[PDB]
């Protein structure tokens, strides 16, 4: 019988049954509706958005961790139970994730609609963070966790969190996405629409690498170099690509190039330790966890070393931890955690959450 | 001696000297070539093209604020200074403008003839939008620049523009001409040509206007009424235009009409201030400023007004500035700038130029 | 003549001429830079970053009584003496004030400005607790000074002070500030900059409020009830608020809210008499006197006597003194003290500095 | 005019005039100085120090019945002229007293500052033991005379001391006080401090008592009963008393307790009589003279009478006599002999004294 | 089997068999439960807790040399015997120490818990200066025995202790950790948590030192020189360290410096060894017996010797012991006593107890 496990997240949906090493079911988080005049189904979800993709308007529930299309929302549960997963929700219970930090709300009618909509026996709502760090397999350590939607750092110390040092930036993968989507003009290619914003997407993940050094890589940009790279398009044309490749994911390290008027991860890292207590912090330094599909970024560790190693003291070691397969983590942790025979007293029964209410949940 | 304020765009080319209230110059961007077989001079611009539209295949060197055809684009300038101005290029210092997120590339060329062709002693280039701002006389306000290329939002708040709010669309006057030329067939008006697509200019300049409440204004327009006009075309023909009056305008906040997923002009202002910090935000709103030759529609305004009323908070003054000459406030900008003591040392001196090179212009 | 009193403290800076009875400039300690690129005067101090705050990155030179950013502060005081006060430093002594406890250095160099920036001919830096006393007119009691920065405890017994009683806490109004920006997120509202960090301190002090009984003060908010407040930003949106009016004041009297292991305010104050001769503790507890901002919030007095009453003695009379204008209390004691003749000794005199050098303000 | 008479003894100053039946002022022999840093008058005297005893190191210039600090002794007798009494020393005569057996130079001195510092016209130094007796109003009886600093035996028949029988113990109320200030922390009461000795004095007067039957009252005491007292501290805080309430004046009468080799004072009065002619000691016995203020406790006369008669013959009647107003006896004494007309020839002139010198007072 | 040493006492447990030489078990008398929420064992003691002391708040059951928090000093002693020293309690006497002048309470209730929680067969307890010369391998001395809660002198003459002579002070090695927290803040090193206490202490035992000529060491200080130090944090961060090095433990002598009224330790020694005969001072003179932790601080001998020697006589010979291993000196002394065959009489057995009850221990 086992579990579910979800991470419904933003950007994609990563959902498989406890116990289990791997999703079964990744998909976009994506709910498609025909553009056009049409009539010569107008929803659809994940991979079918993606394959009709240039008809179809496409929308994103969730936006910076938050769900805001409920509607949107529970059609896409819907796919991942009884299309993705082939299960009958009603005979697992169910862990979700969520984002620190989010509007108390969003967990709230989250749980009500697994309890009300899909019957689920009962359920859990774990930190994504917490998840991470468990899934690596250590007590202790600082998590850094970047998606499409958020950015955190929870700072845990062997199985303490310090709520406190908590830090939370909406830079994200998304974002990252439409600056590609700004900068690509200044060649001229006006990747403009939805659709594009997604191929955009998919120019991420297969270009864009991280600086080491930023300031002579773009002196090295200005050269006529190997930096240059092609690209082809759904309809064959060819794009390509230069200063964009690193640009664009060195905003995560300088806010400002987006709008932000916050620190980049490096400082934003190194703050949250700042915020603990000096007894501990030794650790966090060395048990730095990098996690979430940001981080897939080429060389995304090294560059995070490197300034995180300037801005602490001389002395004091520290190691980044990229544990391969960062972009599954959470679900990863999830599985183990369900498995767990000494969390199975965590789930919250429906009857319990009928006689309690809603505010159980926090 | 002063200097020489050109603004280059889309559709029309508005020259002068700096010092100047008004343009000497307007005329537009277009190049004509004999499309019949004809020898029975194959180059002829702005009126001349005008002159002669029967005859010859119009073109346009811009499109969407870039420059496409830069041999013809440089006959343009040949003649705005040769034969229009009647100016030796080489004695005078020149403004150029250029639509925000124009292609790099674009700014880089279109300088290098500047000093390569003209010789041109000194240059500068300005953002359109910005220019309008300072034709007004502010220094804070949201610019809605929209002409026969592009449309953009550019917000400044005291002397300040704020980069990552700059929005821009291709939705513009050429587009709307277009839209005209396709629904008048429904008449059965075969507005097909190139000369055709001129005429239809006309026609829009003379009959269109912004409906304040479209649907019922399609109501209104279900009923024989005022709303029916004629117009007389070059061969005597005259043509019952009615629903189309506002329908055409209508695209510009209903941008479906055309075919584009992107949001109206009115989603698209608003868009932009919300990506502005919240201490600035009530002073945009209570400055819109609307410039550039596609808001010389009757009630855009008006219109605007409503809309973004109905879109920003109950208790947020709305003051949409509508500066008369809104046409050519841009080239307006540009001589009041050029004119200013405080902007000689912006000039990139052609020198400077030839020892630092085209990036300078960026 | 008579001479300048100013109350450079965090937050705000409080200045004025000896012998009146209120500050003639009240404004921030606020240093503002252009965040955005800007250049489509770099450098706004107080009233001037308020009305510009939505572009400029506001900074704080002091934090925690310790100045920090010598720069920014020297800054501060130019504007203090030539654009507010409109004297020519030169001519007056100057009393200063200083938080109890701070880095001797700190002193040091403050002083050092003050002769060799501003040449001013005299000064004395007294300690902020003790001007506290002396403005309400006493020469017995307890002070409980809290403000922006920090928050101390100085207990004065007919004239003599008891250093070894002193507390000192980094609780303050600057963090109250965070917690906020913290715990609105829990309904949603996302006040992550520093501008929205300065309009929740608008709304600290028009909708916060001290619990008397924060249990049931909790079980109240429970329940939909008159808690709810709806409060006005600068954009028009309106923000609901209600758990939160008494959860970030509690902070004062349950630290670990925050992250800190000491104790509340009552405990500390209560702490600070255990230390002093039990001779010396009953009248410490009939004039137990709050001065400085934080102190403004509603009830909080009532809160203060509820528990210390609790804390002591049940024969013990606790009287707590609220003087009325509280958010002044140490600039007004400093105008007593300087117009004082029997003071005029206590002058330190640039040449007597020059002669015995920094120590001597120590 | 007639005279002053001033009983300047240890612990408690009581002055008056001569021919009145009670002091005028009466206040401690303390001075005190601002134990802490102070000054954010370092002199005070009396009454003075305890009213500020919290801040003051209260010092006592007379120790054991000998002048230590004369600097502060004289200060003392400066306020009794000036500032108690208001009397301008020079126009009266003063009676001034002393502990038999106290070193000779104590004297000395002491009558010298009388006469070059205060210019007292004249002057006589009295036994206290002896102005005790005459007080009552007896010729014969041996007197018990114990205070804060000595305790001594005088035996006296009909009007001729026997000094060959003086006896004299450093065992007193100041080292009782100290007593208890130890033994009151076997409870935890950590009275310390020097106010707290003054504390404890109170203690002493209103809680110890004389145990008829200290065997039996140990006995008793063991068992939980009414001998348990409370008591009210400065602070409001309760302190229950019980054993100690008996321990402490017990070791007058067993020295061991503190540390003293000596016997106690019923064998040392014993001894006393013993030293003294046959025909003598009968009346000695029924004329039992108890003065000083440590003769206060209650019950002391008549535990006294217990162990004496035990210790004399068993057909020897013995009558101690309590003459209430004990502690006031010698000042009651000195202001009789003062008015006496057969006194007058007994004063030391200035005059004679500048004669004579230092040594006519013995 | 032999027997069990305890020498419970504040701030260090230091625990073995009787008749060895040193300690099996050395570690804080310290229980900390987690300071944050947590939960993403709540009671660590002695080397748990310091290892977990970034998270944990960290308490001493003693304080003053008084158990206050029974609890966790139930919990310690549990430790003591079933995890560090490996011992089933009831197989073995123990032999426990106290400082002298506590609570009698205090003892009552200690053995108490040892008879009814632990079933210890029988106990003694020792005054810990008693034992401390016993260690040494005196009869005659006067011990000057200081730890990390109280102080204390104890003049013993030929195994004849004299309780009127015994000195007890609160100053302590917590009092002098504490000073530090407050005086290192002058150069702004807010060590003012917890954690930050126990990091302070490690700077006291690697850093400080007693000044042998305070005023000119002062002197010395005010240039730099070698005097400053630097010392590493946890996190890494350097501290530099400076007259604090000795102004700490001057207090010591200088009382006032924390704000205690009482005489420095020179002071305090020599007024015990004035409250003895005569006949035994010389003695007592030149057996000066220092142990206990907080004489451990260099050159504390060496200034005790100049300090005391200027108190005494001129031809008195003053000789300072310092047997190495001050700081286990009482857990020797316990070993040695408990192995000595004429001490088997002194242990209280279990049954002799049950009948006399209580009051057996003293
Ligand atoms: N292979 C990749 N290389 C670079 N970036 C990637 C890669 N894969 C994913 N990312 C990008 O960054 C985001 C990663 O998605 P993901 O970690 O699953 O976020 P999430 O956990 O699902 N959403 P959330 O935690 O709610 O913010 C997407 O926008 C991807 O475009
Ligand atoms: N009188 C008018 N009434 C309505 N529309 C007009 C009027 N005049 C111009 N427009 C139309 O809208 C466009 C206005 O031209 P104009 O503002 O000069 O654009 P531009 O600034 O020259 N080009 P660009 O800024 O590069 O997009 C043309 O297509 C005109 O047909
Ligand atoms: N009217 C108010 N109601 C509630 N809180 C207030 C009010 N006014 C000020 N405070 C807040 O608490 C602080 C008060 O400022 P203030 O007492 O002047 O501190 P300060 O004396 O200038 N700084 P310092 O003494 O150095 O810590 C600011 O953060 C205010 O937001
Ligand atoms: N009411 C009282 N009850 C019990 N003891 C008292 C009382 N009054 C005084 N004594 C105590 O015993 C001492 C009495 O003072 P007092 O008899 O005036 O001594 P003195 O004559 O002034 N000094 P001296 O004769 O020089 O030793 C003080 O220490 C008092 O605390
Ligand atoms: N190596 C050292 N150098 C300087 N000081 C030390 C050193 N070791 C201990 N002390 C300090 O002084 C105290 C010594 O502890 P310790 O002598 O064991 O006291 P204790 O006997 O256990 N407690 P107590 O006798 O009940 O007051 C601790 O606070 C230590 O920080
Ligand atoms: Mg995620
Ligand atoms: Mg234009
Ligand atoms: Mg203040
Ligand atoms: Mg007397
Ligand atoms: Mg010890």
Redesign the interface.
């Known amino acids: 019988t086992t579990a579910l496990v979800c991470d419904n997240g933003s950007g994609l949906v990563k959902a498989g049954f406890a116990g289990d090493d791997a999703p079964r079911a990744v998909f976009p988080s994506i709910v498609g509706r025909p ?2 005049q049409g009539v010569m189904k107008d929803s659809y979800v994940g991979d079918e958005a993606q394959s009709k993709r240039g008809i179809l ?1 496409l929308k994103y529930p969730i936006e910076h961790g ?1 769900i805001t299309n409920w509607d949107d929302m529970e059609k896409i549960w819907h796919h991942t139970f009884y299309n993705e997963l082939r299960v009958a929700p009603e005979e697992h219970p169910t862990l979700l994730t969520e984002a620190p ?6 967990r709230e009618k989250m749980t009500q609609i697994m309890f009300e909509t899909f019957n689920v026996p009962a359920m859990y709502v774990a ?1 994504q963070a ?1 998840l991470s760090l468990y899934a690596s397999g250590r007590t202790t350590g600082i998590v850094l966790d970047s998606g499409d939607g958020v950015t955190h750092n929870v700072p ?10 908590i830090m939370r930036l ?1 830079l994200a993968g998304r974002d990252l996405t439409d600056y590609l989507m ?1 900068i690509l ?4 290619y ?1 990747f ?3 659709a594009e914003r997604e191929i955009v997407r998919d120019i991420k993940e297969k270009l864009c690498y991280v600086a080491l050094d930023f300031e002579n890589e773009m002196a090295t940009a200005a050269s006529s170099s190997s930096l240059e790279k092609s690209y082809e398009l759904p309809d064959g044309q060819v794009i390509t690509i230069g200063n964009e490749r690193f640009r664009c994911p060195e905003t995560l390290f300088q806010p ?1 190039f ?2 932000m ?2 620190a980049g991860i490096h400082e934003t890292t190194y703050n949250s330790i700042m ?8 650790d966090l330094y060395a048990n730095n966890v990098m996690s979430g599909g940001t981080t897939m970024y080429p060389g995304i560790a090294d560059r995070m070393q490197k300034e995180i190693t300037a801005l ?5 070691k520290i190691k980044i931890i990229a544990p391969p397969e960062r972009k599954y983590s959470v679900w990863i942790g999830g599985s183990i955690l369900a498995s767990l025979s000494t969390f199975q007293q965590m789930w919250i029964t429906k009857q319990e959450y009928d006689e309690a209410g809603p505010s159980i949940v926090h």
């Open positions: 553009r056009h308007t938050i930090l989010n509007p108390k709300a969003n930190i917490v845990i110390y062997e199985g303490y969190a310090l709520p406190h040092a909406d700004k003009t200044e060649r001229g006006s403009v629409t939805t400002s987006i709008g008027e916050s915020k603990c207590d000096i007894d501990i912090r030794k602490a003291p001389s002395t004091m």
